[PDB]
Amino acid sequence: LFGAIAGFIEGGWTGMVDGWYGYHHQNEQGSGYAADQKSTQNAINGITNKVNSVIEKMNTQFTAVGKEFNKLERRMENLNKKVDDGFIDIWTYNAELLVLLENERTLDFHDSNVKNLYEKVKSQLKNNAKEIGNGCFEFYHKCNDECMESVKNGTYDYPKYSEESKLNR
Amino acid sequence: KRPKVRDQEGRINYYWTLLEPGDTIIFEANGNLIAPRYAFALSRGFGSGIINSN
C-alpha cells in the first residue's frame, strides 16, 4: 500500500537475521548487514499488542454442551440447534474475517515502516548522497564505519561532509 | 397386555422428585409400589456435564 515492500525494494534479504528491517553497507572496509533495532522493536511491540489485544476480547468458553429431547419435544430440539449452529456461524465469521482484515493491515504496517526508514535516511543525507532507486544511496563523499554507524544511529553530521560532497556533486 | 420386552409383559413406570431442604415426602399405597431404598443428597457445582465417547 505504501510502495516499499515489493515496490521500489524488490526482494528481501536472507543474510539479515537480526531484525525485520535494516541496512546493507559497503565501504572500503568491507560489506555487511545490520538490523535496525529501534524500528524492529517498535514493530514487535505493535504486533504483540495487536495479537494479544485481539485474543483477550474472546473469553474462553467455560460451560458444557449437550441436551436431550424426547419425540414430543422436537420444537425444542430444533430451537436448541438453531441457537448452537447459529452461534457457531457467527463466531466462524468473526474469526475468519478478522484474520483476513488483520492480516492485510499487518503487511501494510510493515510496508510503512520500511518506507519511513527510507525517508529518514533521505532527511539525513540530503544532497550528500544520490538516490539510485533500487532502495539505496551512493554517497558523494568517502564514508567509513564511523559515519555509516552514524547514519544507522540517526546522528549523521551533514555539515561535516557538506563541502566535500558539494565538490564531487 | 403389552408387547414383551426383555421377556416381560408387565411394566414399571419410574418417577422421581427433588425434595427441598426442610421438607417432608409422604408415600401412600395399597398396592403397586416400588418403594425407594436409597436416596441421593445432591451437592451442586458448575463445570460438569454428560458426554458420549469411546
Amino acid at A34: A
CA distance A26 to A136: 11
Which of A134, A122, A125 lies closest to A156 in space, CA to CA? A125
- Is there a contact between A41 and A47 (Cβ–Cβ < 8 Å)? no
Q: Please tell me if residue A64 touches chain B, with a CB cutoff of 8 Å.
A: yes
Which whole-number Å values give the CA distances from A81 to A70, A89, A94, A128, in the listed order? 15, 12, 20, 71
| Dihedral sign from CA coordinates of A10, A11, A17, A21 | positive
Instruction: Determine whether the interchain pair B50/A62 forms a contact, defined as Cβ–Cβ distance below 8 Å.
Output: no
Give the number of other CB atoms < 10 A from CB of residue A39.
Answer: 19
DSSP 8-state class, residue A164: H
Instruction: Determine whether the interchain pair A66/B48 forms a contact, defined as Cβ–Cβ distance below 8 Å.
Output: no
A63 CB neighbours in chain B (<8 A) are 46
Q: Would you call A41 helix, strand, or coil by DSSP?
A: helix
- Is there a contact between A133 and A8 (Cβ–Cβ < 8 Å)? yes
Rg of chain B taking only CA atoms, in angstroms: 17
Which of A105, A146, A151 lies closest to A128 in space, CA to CA? A151
What cell was used for B36? Answer: 425407594
H/E element, A138 = strand A137-139
| Dihedral sign from CA coordinates of A92, B54, B47, B16 | positive
CB contact set of A110 (below 8 Å; sequence gap of 6+) = A5, A20, A43
Q: Please tell me if residue A62 touches chain B, with a CB cutoff of 8 Å.
A: yes
- Is there a contact between A75 and A27 (Cβ–Cβ < 8 Å)? no
- Locate the chain B residue with the closest alpha carbon to A64: B49
Amino acid at A28: E
Which of A146, A160, A150, A154 lies closest to A119 in space, CA to CA? A154
Instruction: Determine whether the interchain pair A66/B51 forms a contact, defined as Cβ–Cβ distance below 8 Å.
Output: yes
Minimum distance, in Å, between the CA of residue B39 and any CA atom of chain A: 24
Which of A25, A24, A20 lies closest to A42 in space, CA to CA? A20
Which of A147, A140, A148, A114 lies closest to A34 in space, CA to CA? A148
Angle A37-56/A74-125 helices, nearest 10 degrees?
170
Rg of chain A taking only CA atoms, in angstroms: 27
The position carrying cell 430451537 is A79
Helices (H) and strands (E) in chain A, counts: 4, 4
Give the distance, in angstroms, between the CA of residue A93 and the centroid of all CA atoms in the same chain.
26
**Structure resolution in Å?**
2.8
Angle A74-125/A145-153 helices, nearest 10 degrees?
140
Interface residues of B toward A, Cβ cutoff 8 Å, are: 46-51
B47 CB neighbours in chain A (<8 A) are 62, 64
CA distance A114 to B25: 79
The position carrying cell 454428560 is B50
Report how this structure was experimentally obtained.
cryo-EM
Which of A38, A39, A36 lies closest to A18 in space, CA to CA? A36
Minimum distance, in Å, between the CA of residue B53 and any CA atom of chain A: 13
The position carrying cell 504483540 is A48
A64 CB neighbours in chain B (<8 A) are 47-49, 51
Of A62, A63, A66, Cβ closest to residue B50: A66
Instruction: Determine whether the interchain pair B47/A66 forms a contact, defined as Cβ–Cβ distance below 8 Å.
Output: no
CA distance A89 to B39: 43
CA distance A55 to A61: 13
Longest dimension (CA), chain A: 97
